[PDB]
Amino acid sequence: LHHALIPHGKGGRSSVSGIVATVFGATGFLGRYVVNHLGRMGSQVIVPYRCEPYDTMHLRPMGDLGQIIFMEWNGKDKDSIRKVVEHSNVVINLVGREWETKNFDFEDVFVKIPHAIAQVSKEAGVEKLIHISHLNADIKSPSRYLRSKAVGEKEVRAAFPEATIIKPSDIFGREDRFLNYFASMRLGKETVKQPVYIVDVSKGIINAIKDPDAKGKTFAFVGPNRYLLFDLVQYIFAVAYRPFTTRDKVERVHMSDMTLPHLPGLEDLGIQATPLELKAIEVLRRHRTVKPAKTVN
Amino acid sequence: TRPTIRPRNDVVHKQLSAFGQYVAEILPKYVQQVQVSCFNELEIFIHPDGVIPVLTFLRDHTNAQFKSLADLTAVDVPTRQNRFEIVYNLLSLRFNSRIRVKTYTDELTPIESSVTVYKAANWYEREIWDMFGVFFANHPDLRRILTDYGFEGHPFRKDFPLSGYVELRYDDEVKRVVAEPVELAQEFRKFDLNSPWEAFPAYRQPPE
Amino acid sequence: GVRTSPTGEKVTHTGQAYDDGDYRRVRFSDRQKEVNENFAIDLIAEQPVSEVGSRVISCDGGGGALGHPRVYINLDKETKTGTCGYCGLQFRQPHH
Amino acid sequence: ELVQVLRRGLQQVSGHGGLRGYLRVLFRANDVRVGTLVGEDKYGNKYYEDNKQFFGRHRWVIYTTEMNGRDTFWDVDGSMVPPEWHRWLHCMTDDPPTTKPPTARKYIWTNHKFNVSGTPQQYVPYSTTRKKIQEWVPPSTPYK
Amino acid sequence: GTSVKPIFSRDMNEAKRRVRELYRAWYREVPNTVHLFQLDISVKQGRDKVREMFMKNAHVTDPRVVDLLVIKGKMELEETINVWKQRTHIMRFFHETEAPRPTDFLSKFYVGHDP
Amino acid sequence: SRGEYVVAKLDDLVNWARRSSLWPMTFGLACCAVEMMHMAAPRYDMDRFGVVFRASPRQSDVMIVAGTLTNKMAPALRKVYDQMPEPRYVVSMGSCANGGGYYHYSYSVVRGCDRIVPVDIYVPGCPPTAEALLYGILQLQRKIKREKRLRIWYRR
Amino acid sequence: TYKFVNMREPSMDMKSVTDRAAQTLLWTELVRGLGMTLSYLFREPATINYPFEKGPLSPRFRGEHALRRYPSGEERCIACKLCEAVCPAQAITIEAEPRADGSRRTTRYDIDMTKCIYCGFCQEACPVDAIVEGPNFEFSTETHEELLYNKEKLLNNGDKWEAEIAANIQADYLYR
Amino acid sequence: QLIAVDEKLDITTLTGVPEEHIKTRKVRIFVPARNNMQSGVNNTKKWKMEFDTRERWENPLMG
Amino acid sequence: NLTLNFGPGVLRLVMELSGEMVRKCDPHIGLLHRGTEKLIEYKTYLQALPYFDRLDYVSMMCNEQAYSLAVEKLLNIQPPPRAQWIRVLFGEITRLLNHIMAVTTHALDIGAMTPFFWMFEEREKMFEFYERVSGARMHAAYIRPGGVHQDLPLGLLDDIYEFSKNFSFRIDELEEMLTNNRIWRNRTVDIGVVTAEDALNYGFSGVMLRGSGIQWDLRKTQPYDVYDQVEFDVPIGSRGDCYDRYLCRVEEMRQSLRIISQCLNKMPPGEIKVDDAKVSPPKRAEMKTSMESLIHHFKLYTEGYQVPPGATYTAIEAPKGEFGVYLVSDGSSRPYRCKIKAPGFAHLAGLDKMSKGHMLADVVAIIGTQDIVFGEVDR
Amino acid sequence: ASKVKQDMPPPGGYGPIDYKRNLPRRGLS
Ligand SMILES: CCCCCCCCCCCCCCCCC[C@@H](O)O[C@H](CO[C@H](O)CCCCCCCCCCCCCCC)COP(=O)(O)OCC[N+](C)(C)C
Ligand SMILES: NC(=O)C1=CN([C@@H]2O[C@H](COP(=O)(O)OP(=O)(O)OC[C@H]3O[C@@H](n4cnc5c(N)ncnc54)[C@H](OP(=O)(O)O)[C@@H]3O)[C@@H](O)[C@H]2O)C=CC1
Ligand code: SF4
Ligand code: SF4
Ligand code: SF4
Ligand SMILES: [Zn+2]
User: Which of B174, G143, F82 has its CA nearest to residue A36?
Assistant: First the structure.
């Protein structure tokens, strides 16, 4: 196991966990939680950042001295990926943009970059690769985002046969784009949503890293309760004490949440999914200046 | 004794010994011992119940009037049954002199608070409670003064570890400062500096 | 006398170099590894051996009070040369 | 009088090699004083003194416009002064390294380097000791 | 014999009385503490935490120790009433950032040598 | 084309503005604050660099942590950092703020202010002379000059 | 002997009373303070033109550490570990072993410059003048890790600053 | 004025030590053995109480 | 009546106010408690000397002197005469530094803020004096428990004299700005009045005593190094208010100048540390030529010197008041107990009483006139 | 050979140092 990688300590800040993890897209909403969960337990995190060094500054106190190493990269080049994942044994893929840019479309973000990452990871000898796709990802879907996810998920599994795919279902959190999106508005009764908490997704990724038998498996990370869109927005506006993103976001948010009973979930990794009723107040206490919504099961 | 040795004062030694006699004679109910060191420091060892009475007498008597309380502290000697040693240092401006009063206690026996005699002792006593866990009865407001709010333990006790038990950092998950068990990147190096071959024969103890 | 590892890393005067499978090499990516080029063992190997016609010779390292503590070295063994414990300089009696 | 200070200002303008050098030193060092040149540095720094100024302002350095590898027309810092001129400039001695050079040693750096933090040449800490415990190597031959 | 000097009580009954009074005060305070410090926990969780803290010291059989713990708890209560603490001090009682330390022998055996 | 030229020039203008007027607040926790005040003294005169003396936390650009950070103090440090307008920079001054220093193995001391806030510049010393702190401030200014926010946004 | 700072008695004759009233009404002491500040405006400022001008220092000044070596080129340190025994802040870590020629030399020499208190005890405990605390004070850093010096960094510091370090030691060693 | 209660003294609830640093540690009470490198005996006079050695590992940075 | 919490040296202050008048004042300290006293028990005496520089960090060599005096009393040795003269000279320089800092920051908090710069120029000059002697601008660690670390360089006394013969005019300019200004008077006069009996009972010392008329000074009553030999006057106030303490501190600056002149003139020749190589280390040349000197250097820098068992309380007249140390030695090379008595602790304790029936803006003036530095208050 | 040379005040000492308060009266009734 290459002695330098043997775990040591009591699982603390200055301990060693034997995890050399390269977290692509660590500067996002999910990336900060993933990096924090990795670094609070003694693992080394390599972070590749396209953006200014100032943006990443928040991550600095997430690990002990020398445990977090920042390097620059770009998806268009393979040498940068090779030098970033050269020494890692775990590669986590969190790259993803919800919209379109003049240099990166959904095909660039969700297909080419993950495929190149998986190919380089396989070439370099990375033991484990974890990929993030969507719960609603299928080739036939009208939305480009979901359609792109399906093509990418397939091509990654082709490149890295023993990769682990995680399909979170509409993550919500303190910096999320769901509850913030509906609380900033200040069409429904047919769309049902299945949100999942951000801490649960991060712990699921960590457990999938620590779980040996989850090599080729695929997971669907879903919350405890299913909510209609209308009464969920009603609850969101009630918590904020309020009276009651171009084209792809609306078409994706009016799309109902799929159900995949065959795929293993968070409970198979040992995570009790946290109900949205506990964390809604935590997220929405800042939008201010109780009667939870009914759930369908 | 050539220039490298501290000069000795016999007159002050005699005067302090005489005043030790005087204090001993006046208060036989509480005083247990009187000592005058080689560098002319006079300390009186008393029973805990005499703290209010001994302190009041030193301050008010026409021959003592030790009106100033220079310091009040505690010493931890775990080998003793009465673990903590409470020390009072008093200054008299009238006679230009200093005195020391020593007392003993343990974990569960309180000491009478001398805020009534000296207003200076108030904060001092709080510090002792914060640092050793010595309780003072009838203290106007006894609470921690130096340690963090919610800090468990008394750091200046000899069995408290140097780095304590918990340490603070910032967690972005809960978005707040959290306290977790202490882990050190480099552990403190304990040095065995003491040598054999005793240095001062005058303090040699009987071999029992 | 700086050498080079098979992986490409420079070898310090202490002989330290990460092996091929060691992840810690990641710390040197996009950066450099701090290595002293002047190896003291090679530099002291280049010094001449002095020849003094006495059985015992004293060394203070040069400079007087700016050197090391004075030491005395016996030069009775003809098979080798006397080496200062601090400075590393070598002395010898004039054989033949 | 006032005409005297004006003539000193004009001499101060002229002693910088014209208006161009005057504006150069004004926009680079925020100071246009003229003092006697003490010495030249192999990296391009110039050293001046003026004993009529008060202590602290009686010696100064004009940094070079290009040190080892970067353009230093604006980005100047105090780590660019070599150790001998560092000792002279910080008033640890009265003797500039021109009158009495330092002792020459084969191991002394022949090329001073400034602060290299935030730069691929920055120092990365690492352990200089070898592995303490050695592991057992299993045999390559089969047992049965 | 073994005569010792009282702090506040003469026997264990008065110590129990003081413990009950302190628990009364803490139970009264939990709602105002949760509301004022803007905790994300429920008042049920805070009261359960108070119960757990009181239960930690259930095996004490010495009135001096018991009323010394009562004095300490009263100090803590006065800290919380006067808002001398912050959210971080209050939140610590819950160890929400610490990984669950396992108890079974097999799990401990795998992680390390610590018994 | 001209698209990159215009953003480069505008970024240069914004960087020059941001680094040519740095308004610090100083947590004068301990004796490093004395050398911080000596940097505001006539001899070094931080004000002449555009670095005003004792700006309010609401309009402060850089936080200078000069002194020992105790456990009793870390929540207040983080709270004051959280209230700062962005862009915000943190400068660690002296051993106590850098890594605990002479009180590193203490039960009541935070082993470095970077356990609490991200730090941009480390100024080593016990205490760093006022000139060393001035060098650190100018190094932070050069670091700001090196950053490039508009180009990164353009290429994304 | 003792003095009185505030034991003055104001004169109660008519002239003194009128002086006090005129001071109250016309603000004479306020104008006099104005004059003091005005006079202070017209004198030369004490500011120096950093970084083009430097504050005066001494040969005794303590700064960035360095490991020196003899004229031959061999390092002075002999792993006696007195600097590590005397360090008030426990910033020095040392490991040694016999070299390939039997010499007593270190294999690890680390100084945590975030623990150091720059007291100079290490350089005055060393019997061979190996560890010194040199003149450099402008070595601020952008990361915590670059302030954890190992043997290579300190040896490079010594080879970088040797000229001025040796000059300062020559200037000051007769006081030790 | 005196309780005269009879019970063994146990202050564990007042010292503030964590739970697992009381019921898991094993202390050793001993008179330290004389160093065999020296013939002095002044270090073998008192009794020392020390604890059981726990795990020490290597720091990935600086070792 | 409402409760205000003025949070973040660094001080937290909880006050009950009825209108503008201060009804109750409660300082919360411990924001700079590092645990110096417990950390000292793990260091030798030489290793524990530098903590005292950090204790009261505006008057460093005064703390060094108090610690050295305590350790010397327990060691039963005495420093050479020249070491004592150097100690007293640098103690008076340190008193000048502390008084400048205290007065000018008092004015700054009130709002004057110009003498702050005017006199921090002089403070920088005095830091240069500290640097020349020890290589460190403030934490010199120059005064050791056997004398002083190193001798003065050959040009130091001339520069000290040159500095000290112009300082009186700087004090005069400060007085012109502050002493007679009516706004300064109305900010300071009849504010924070303390009676002599309450000052004695509350444990006050230093100027806080003399501001109320009490004739006490440890440099006069219980002289320690060479203080008895030098002549100076002890300024005594009359009203016990902030203005009298201001006047006392300015006159103390002047008397410190007087003592500095005397010390400059009466410097004796000789050595600087006690000639006892089992307490004070030998010279480098002796250490590099003599066997006994090398052995003693080795043992003194690895193990340290053993101090005979005993407990002492040593006090000095530090600029902020009576600064004392209660030192307990068990016979080994590490102190068994080191309690530190700082006057700031007692003064901040008395702040609550001294700020009774005053405006909220007078708490600032009272805290300033107490001369509180929280390194010594919290330790 | 050489004799003792250390920092000492010059022969005859240093010149007097002013320390008295000096606040002159400008002067007008
Ligand atoms: C008129 C319309 C107004 C619209 C709004 C704009 C606001 C007004 C614009 C005018 C701003 C003035 C800019 C002048 C800056 C030049 C300063 C010069 O000295 O900087 C030099 C070089 O700095 C930079 O290299 C130059 C950057 C200046 C701006 C570059 C191009 C900006 C033009 C864009 C204008 C279009 C405006 C459109 C937006 C509304 C060196 O300084 P620096 O190195 O720091 O300091 C080192 C100090 N030393 C020398 C003592 C060591
Ligand atoms: N709604 C949700 O939160 C859940 C998200 N999905 C998946 O989760 C992934 C990440 O989650 P999330 O935190 O919400 O995404 P974010 O928008 O918060 O962050 C995107 C991350 O990917 C990086 N990134 C994006 N585009 C590029 C690019 N063209 N080149 C290089 N890096 C890039 C970002 O860096 P930078 O900021 O510099 O651009 C950033 O690190 C995504 O890939 C998404 O598909 C899973 C289910 C729902
Ligand atoms: S960092 Fe050093 S100088 Fe600053 S307060 Fe701490 S000990 Fe003193
Ligand atoms: S630097 Fe000097 S004191 Fe330190 S180990 Fe080396 S030889 Fe010994
Ligand atoms: S200067 Fe002092 S603290 Fe720093 S390494 Fe040397 S002995 Fe240790
Ligand atoms: Zn030699």
Answer: B174
Three-state SS for G96?
strand
Binding residues of A: 25, 27, 29-30, 50, 95-97, 145, 149
CATH code of G102's domain? 3.30.70.3270
E107 Cβ neighbours under 8 A, 6+ residues apart = none
Cα gap I371→I359, rounded to integer Å: 19
**In Å, how far is F86's CA from the nearest CA of chain I?**
21
Q: By residue range, what is the domain housing residue E37?
A: 1-115
Resolution attained, angstroms: 2.8
Paired residues of B167 in beta bridges: B180
Measured between alpha carbons, how far is I182 from I188 in angstroms, rounded to an integer? 10
Secondary structure of chain A as H, E, C letters: CCHHHCCECCCCCCCECCCEEEEECCCCHHHHHHHHHHHCCCCEEEEECCCCHHHHHHHHHHCCCCCEEEECCCCCCHHHHHHHCCCCCEEEECCCCCCCCCCCCHHHHHHHHHHHHHHHHHHHCCCEEEEECCCCCCCCCCCHHHHHHHHHHHHHHHHCCCCEEEEECCEECCCCCCHHHHHCCCCCCCCEECCEEHHHHHHHHHHHHHCCCCCCCEEEECCCCCEEHHHHHHHHHHHCCCCCCCCHHHHHHCCCCCCCCCCCCHHHHCCCCCCHHHHHHHHHCCCCCCCCCCECC
SS3 at position I18? strand
**F138: containing domain:** 2-155
Task: Please check if F113 is assigned to a binding site.
Answer: no
Q: Which ligand is nearest to the CA of C72?
A: 6
Separation between Cα atoms, residue D15 and residue D9, nearest integer Å: 10
Q: Which residue of G has its CA nearest to A70?
A: G143
Domain that holds residue A48: 1-297
Obtained via which technique?
cryo-EM
Compute the distance from residue C86 Cα to the ligand 4 centre, in Å. 11
Distance CA F105, CA F72 (A): 16
In whole angstroms, what separates CA G119 from the centre of its chain?
Answer: 9
Please tell me the residue having the least CA distance from ligand 2 atom 47. A168
The verdict on F152 touching I (C-beta cutoff 8 Å) is no
- How many Cβ contacts (< 8 angstroms) between chains C and G? 66
- CA dist E110 and E88 (Å) reads 33
Question: Could I33 and F41 be called an inter-chain contact, meaning their C-beta atoms sit closer than 8 Å?
Answer: no
Please indicate whether residue F128, judged by its CB atom, sits closer than 6 Å to ligand 3: no
Q: How many Cβ atoms sit within 10 Å of the Cβ of residue I184?
A: 21
Return the SS3 of I281. Answer: coil
Best mutation target among B170, B172, B191 (most F Cβ atoms within 10 Å) is B170
In sign, the C-alpha dihedral spanning A244, A250, A256, A259 is negative
Give the number of domains in chain E: 1
Distance G147 CA to ligand 1 centre (A): 34
We report the CATH number of the domain holding residue F147 as: 3.40.50.12280
CB contact under 8 A, E97 and A7: no
In the chain, the amino acid numbered B109 is T
Helix, strand, coil share of chain G (percent; to 5): 35, 15, 45
Helix (H, G, I), strand (E, B) or coil at J7: coil
The encoded tokens of residue D49 equal: 């003194």
Q: Which helix (DSSP H) or strand (DSSP E) does residue J15 occupy?
A: none
CB contact under 8 A, G5 and I251: yes
Domain that holds residue G124: 65-175
A174: left (phi over 0), alpha (psi -120 to 50) or beta: alpha
Say which residues have a Cβ less than 8 Å from residue D8's Cβ, sequence separation at least 6: none
Give me the number of domains chain F comprises. Answer: 1
| d(C-alpha A278, C-alpha A296), whole Å | 18
Using the Cα atoms of residue A30, residue A31, residue A34 and residue A37 in order, give the sign of their dihedral.
negative
